[PDB]
Coordinates of C-alpha atoms (C1' of nucleotides) and ligand atoms in Angstrom, one line a residue:
Chain A
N5 CA -108.8 25.6 -56.4
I6 CA -110.7 26.3 -53.2
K7 CA -110.8 29.6 -51.1
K8 CA -109.9 29.2 -47.4
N9 CA -113.2 31.0 -46.5
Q10 CA -115.0 27.9 -47.9
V11 CA -113.3 25.4 -45.5
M12 CA -112.3 27.3 -42.3
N13 CA -115.3 26.1 -40.3
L14 CA -115.8 22.6 -41.6
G15 CA -115.0 19.3 -39.7
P16 CA -111.4 18.1 -39.4
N17 CA -112.0 15.2 -41.7
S18 CA -114.0 17.2 -44.2
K19 CA -113.2 16.2 -47.9
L20 CA -113.4 19.9 -49.0
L21 CA -110.7 20.7 -46.3
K22 CA -108.5 17.9 -47.5
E23 CA -108.9 19.2 -51.1
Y24 CA -108.0 22.7 -49.9
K25 CA -104.9 21.2 -48.1
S26 CA -103.9 19.3 -51.3
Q27 CA -103.6 22.6 -53.3
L28 CA -100.9 23.8 -50.9
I29 CA -97.5 22.3 -51.7
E30 CA -94.8 24.4 -49.9
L31 CA -94.3 27.1 -47.3
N32 CA -93.4 30.4 -49.0
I33 CA -89.9 31.7 -48.4
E34 CA -91.1 34.0 -45.6
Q35 CA -93.0 31.3 -43.7
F36 CA -89.9 29.0 -43.8
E37 CA -87.4 31.7 -42.9
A38 CA -89.5 33.0 -40.0
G39 CA -90.2 29.3 -39.0
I40 CA -86.5 28.8 -38.3
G41 CA -86.5 31.7 -35.8
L42 CA -89.8 30.6 -34.3
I43 CA -88.7 27.1 -33.6
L44 CA -85.5 28.5 -32.1
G45 CA -87.9 30.6 -30.0
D46 CA -91.5 30.0 -28.8
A47 CA -92.8 27.5 -31.4
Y48 CA -93.9 23.9 -31.0
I49 CA -93.6 21.8 -34.1
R50 CA -95.3 18.4 -33.7
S51 CA -96.2 15.3 -35.5
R52 CA -99.0 12.9 -34.5
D53 CA -98.2 10.5 -37.3
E54 CA -94.7 9.1 -37.5
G55 CA -93.3 12.3 -39.2
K56 CA -95.6 12.2 -42.2
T57 CA -97.0 15.6 -41.3
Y58 CA -96.3 18.4 -38.9
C59 CA -98.2 21.3 -37.4
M60 CA -97.1 24.3 -35.3
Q61 CA -98.8 25.1 -32.1
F62 CA -98.5 28.6 -30.7
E63 CA -99.2 30.3 -27.4
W64 CA -98.3 33.9 -26.5
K65 CA -99.3 36.5 -24.0
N66 CA -99.0 39.2 -26.8
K67 CA -102.2 39.0 -28.8
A68 CA -100.9 41.3 -31.6
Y69 CA -97.8 39.1 -32.1
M70 CA -100.1 36.1 -32.2
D71 CA -102.2 37.9 -34.8
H72 CA -99.1 38.8 -36.8
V73 CA -97.8 35.2 -36.8
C74 CA -101.3 33.9 -37.8
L75 CA -101.4 36.3 -40.7
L76 CA -97.9 35.2 -41.8
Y77 CA -99.1 31.6 -41.9
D78 CA -102.6 32.7 -43.2
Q79 CA -103.2 29.9 -45.7
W80 CA -102.2 27.3 -43.0
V81 CA -104.3 28.7 -40.2
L82 CA -108.1 28.2 -40.1
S83 CA -109.0 29.8 -36.8
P84 CA -108.4 33.2 -35.2
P85 CA -106.4 33.1 -31.9
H86 CA -108.4 31.7 -29.0
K87 CA -108.3 33.2 -25.5
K88 CA -106.8 30.8 -22.9
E89 CA -107.7 31.7 -19.3
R90 CA -106.1 29.6 -16.5
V91 CA -106.0 29.6 -12.7
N92 CA -102.6 29.4 -11.0
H93 CA -101.6 27.3 -8.0
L94 CA -101.6 30.7 -6.1
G95 CA -105.2 31.4 -7.3
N96 CA -104.1 34.0 -9.9
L97 CA -105.7 34.3 -13.4
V98 CA -103.4 33.9 -16.3
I99 CA -104.3 35.0 -19.9
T100 CA -102.5 33.9 -23.0
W101 CA -103.6 33.4 -26.7
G102 CA -103.6 30.0 -28.5
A103 CA -103.5 29.1 -32.1
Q104 CA -102.3 26.3 -34.4
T105 CA -101.7 25.5 -38.1
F106 CA -103.3 22.4 -39.5
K107 CA -100.9 19.5 -40.1
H108 CA -99.2 19.4 -43.5
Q109 CA -96.2 17.8 -45.2
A110 CA -95.0 21.3 -46.0
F111 CA -94.1 21.7 -42.3
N112 CA -91.8 18.6 -42.6
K113 CA -89.1 20.9 -44.1
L114 CA -88.9 22.9 -40.9
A115 CA -89.1 19.8 -38.6
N116 CA -86.4 17.9 -40.5
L117 CA -83.9 20.6 -39.4
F118 CA -84.7 20.3 -35.7
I119 CA -86.7 17.2 -34.9
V120 CA -84.5 14.2 -35.4
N121 CA -85.5 10.9 -33.9
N122 CA -88.5 12.5 -32.0
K123 CA -86.4 15.1 -30.1
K124 CA -85.8 18.8 -30.6
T125 CA -82.1 19.3 -31.5
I126 CA -80.0 21.9 -33.3
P127 CA -77.9 20.9 -36.3
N128 CA -74.2 21.9 -36.4
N129 CA -74.2 24.8 -38.9
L130 CA -77.9 25.9 -38.4
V131 CA -77.2 29.7 -38.1
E132 CA -74.6 29.7 -40.9
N133 CA -76.7 27.9 -43.5
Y134 CA -80.3 28.8 -42.7
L135 CA -80.7 31.8 -40.3
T136 CA -81.6 34.8 -42.3
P137 CA -82.3 38.4 -41.0
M138 CA -86.0 37.4 -40.9
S139 CA -85.3 34.3 -38.8
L140 CA -83.2 36.4 -36.3
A141 CA -86.1 38.8 -36.0
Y142 CA -88.7 36.2 -35.1
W143 CA -86.1 34.5 -32.8
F144 CA -85.6 37.8 -31.0
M145 CA -89.4 38.4 -30.8
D146 CA -89.8 35.0 -29.3
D147 CA -86.7 34.7 -27.0
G148 CA -85.2 38.2 -27.0
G149 CA -84.9 41.0 -24.4
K150 CA -82.7 43.3 -22.4
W151 CA -79.7 42.4 -20.3
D152 CA -80.3 45.5 -18.1
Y153 CA -83.9 46.1 -17.1
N154 CA -83.1 49.0 -14.7
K155 CA -85.1 52.2 -15.3
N156 CA -82.9 54.9 -17.0
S157 CA -80.3 52.4 -18.1
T158 CA -77.6 53.2 -20.7
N159 CA -76.9 49.6 -21.4
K160 CA -77.9 48.4 -24.9
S161 CA -76.9 44.7 -24.5
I162 CA -79.4 42.1 -25.8
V163 CA -80.3 38.7 -24.4
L164 CA -81.6 35.7 -26.2
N165 CA -83.3 33.3 -23.8
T166 CA -82.0 29.9 -25.0
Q167 CA -82.3 28.0 -21.6
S168 CA -83.9 24.9 -23.2
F169 CA -80.8 24.1 -25.2
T170 CA -77.6 22.4 -24.1
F171 CA -74.5 24.5 -23.5
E172 CA -72.8 22.8 -26.5
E173 CA -75.8 23.7 -28.8
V174 CA -75.7 27.4 -27.7
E175 CA -72.0 27.6 -28.2
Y176 CA -72.5 26.5 -31.9
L177 CA -75.3 29.2 -32.2
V178 CA -72.9 31.8 -30.9
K179 CA -70.1 30.7 -33.4
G180 CA -72.7 31.2 -36.2
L181 CA -74.0 34.6 -35.0
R182 CA -70.4 35.9 -34.8
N183 CA -69.3 34.6 -38.2
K184 CA -72.5 35.4 -40.3
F185 CA -73.7 38.7 -38.8
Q186 CA -70.5 40.1 -37.2
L187 CA -72.3 40.2 -33.9
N188 CA -70.1 40.5 -30.8
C189 CA -71.8 37.9 -28.7
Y190 CA -71.1 35.1 -26.2
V191 CA -72.7 32.5 -23.9
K192 CA -73.7 33.6 -20.3
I193 CA -75.3 31.7 -17.4
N194 CA -78.8 32.0 -15.9
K195 CA -80.2 29.3 -13.6
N196 CA -77.3 27.0 -14.5
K197 CA -78.5 27.3 -18.1
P198 CA -77.3 29.0 -21.3
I199 CA -78.3 32.4 -22.6
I200 CA -76.8 34.4 -25.5
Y201 CA -75.4 37.8 -24.6
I202 CA -75.1 40.4 -27.4
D203 CA -72.9 43.4 -26.4
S204 CA -74.1 47.0 -26.6
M205 CA -71.4 47.7 -29.2
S206 CA -73.3 45.5 -31.6
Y207 CA -76.8 46.9 -30.8
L208 CA -77.0 48.9 -34.1
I209 CA -75.8 45.9 -36.1
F210 CA -78.5 43.6 -34.6
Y211 CA -81.2 46.3 -34.7
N212 CA -80.6 47.0 -38.4
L213 CA -80.9 43.3 -39.4
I214 CA -84.2 42.8 -37.7
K215 CA -86.0 46.2 -38.0
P216 CA -87.7 45.3 -41.3
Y217 CA -89.6 42.4 -39.6
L218 CA -90.4 43.5 -36.0
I219 CA -93.8 44.8 -35.0
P220 CA -94.5 48.0 -32.9
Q221 CA -95.9 46.1 -29.9
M222 CA -92.6 44.1 -29.7
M223 CA -90.4 47.2 -29.6
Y224 CA -90.5 47.4 -25.8
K225 CA -88.1 44.4 -25.8
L226 CA -85.3 46.6 -27.3
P227 CA -83.1 48.7 -25.0
Chain B
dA1 C1' -72.4 56.8 -5.2
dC2 C1' -74.2 54.1 -8.3
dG3 C1' -73.4 50.5 -12.8
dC4 C1' -74.1 46.1 -13.1
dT5 C1' -75.4 41.2 -12.7
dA6 C1' -76.4 36.9 -10.1
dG7 C1' -80.3 35.2 -8.3
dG8 C1' -85.6 35.3 -7.5
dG9 C1' -90.3 34.1 -8.8
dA10 C1' -94.7 34.2 -10.9
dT11 C1' -95.6 33.9 -15.1
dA12 C1' -95.6 33.1 -20.5
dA13 C1' -95.0 29.6 -22.6
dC14 C1' -94.0 24.3 -24.5
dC15 C1' -95.8 19.9 -24.6
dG16 C1' -99.0 16.0 -25.4
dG17 C1' -103.8 14.2 -24.6
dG18 C1' -108.7 14.3 -25.5
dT19 C1' -112.6 15.0 -28.4
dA20 C1' -116.2 16.7 -31.5
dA21 C1' -117.0 16.5 -36.3
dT22 C1' -116.8 13.8 -41.6
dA23 C1' -116.0 9.7 -44.3
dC24 C1' -117.1 5.1 -45.3
Chain C
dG1 C1' -117.3 0.6 -35.8
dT2 C1' -112.9 2.6 -37.1
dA3 C1' -110.0 6.2 -39.2
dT4 C1' -109.2 10.8 -39.3
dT5 C1' -107.7 15.6 -37.2
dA6 C1' -108.3 20.8 -36.0
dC7 C1' -109.4 23.0 -31.9
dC8 C1' -109.2 22.8 -27.6
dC9 C1' -107.5 21.4 -22.7
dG10 C1' -104.5 20.9 -18.5
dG11 C1' -99.5 19.3 -16.5
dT12 C1' -95.5 21.7 -16.0
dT13 C1' -91.5 24.8 -15.7
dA14 C1' -87.7 27.4 -18.1
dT15 C1' -88.7 32.0 -19.2
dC16 C1' -88.7 36.9 -18.6
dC17 C1' -88.5 40.5 -16.4
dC18 C1' -87.1 42.8 -11.4
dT19 C1' -83.9 44.1 -8.2
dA20 C1' -80.5 43.3 -4.0
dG21 C1' -76.6 44.8 -2.6
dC22 C1' -71.8 43.6 -4.7
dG23 C1' -67.8 45.9 -6.4
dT24 C1' -65.3 49.6 -7.2
Ligands
CA301 CA1 -88.4 29.9 -26.0
CA302 CA1 -91.4 34.7 -25.5
CA303 CA1 -90.6 27.1 -21.5

DNA sequence: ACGCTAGGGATAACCGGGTAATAC
DNA sequence: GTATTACCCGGTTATCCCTAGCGT
């Protein structure tokens, strides 16, 4: 076998890299479980072939989170996160951090769940059959936040920013969250698009499930 | 008198395209 | 010359927080 340190700065078509890639067969349980939450959240899973391999591309303002995800997928990630500096239409500078895994058939398992016929969809019983506490944690860290951002608020209600999904898809996600994790949640409307509202009653239930997996610099998102 | 939420707006992300670097 | 592909880019906007001023 080959150590990552030996390949991480070779060319894309380097034979040693391909030999390093061939040693890896599957995502570990943690990378797959977190992957579910990430693809529900801020993650871009893509194929350049016809579904033979997939990679995940990442972009985040939060560098520490980017770092944490890169460490989680360490064996799949050759490069540190690269700084992305861009200029707005208003003239403002915008900083974010970019990273990607290399492409690999091990990522097909994640893609098969969501990417059917070249389009990001949600399967019927996704939450019920796949979403673990770890998945929920990464989903929250990607899409999660407060319902009440007022200073000195007593409201402990959570929001999951699911605006890219259809109303029907989000309803199914709600049905799952309620049945599997006993969360008192329902669909609400922002910009004529769906979000998931988790009531303040269920705050402790939600927080206890995800606490093992969240990082300090993502705690600001919690009420 | 003030908890709460619909609506605002500049991002913080998603999404594909291009290319520099091996192999043959 | 062609295939290969990880690390960038830049086009876009649905996010992701902030708050007006509604409702009681
Ligand atoms: Ca998202
Ligand atoms: Ca996010
Ligand atoms: Ca988006």
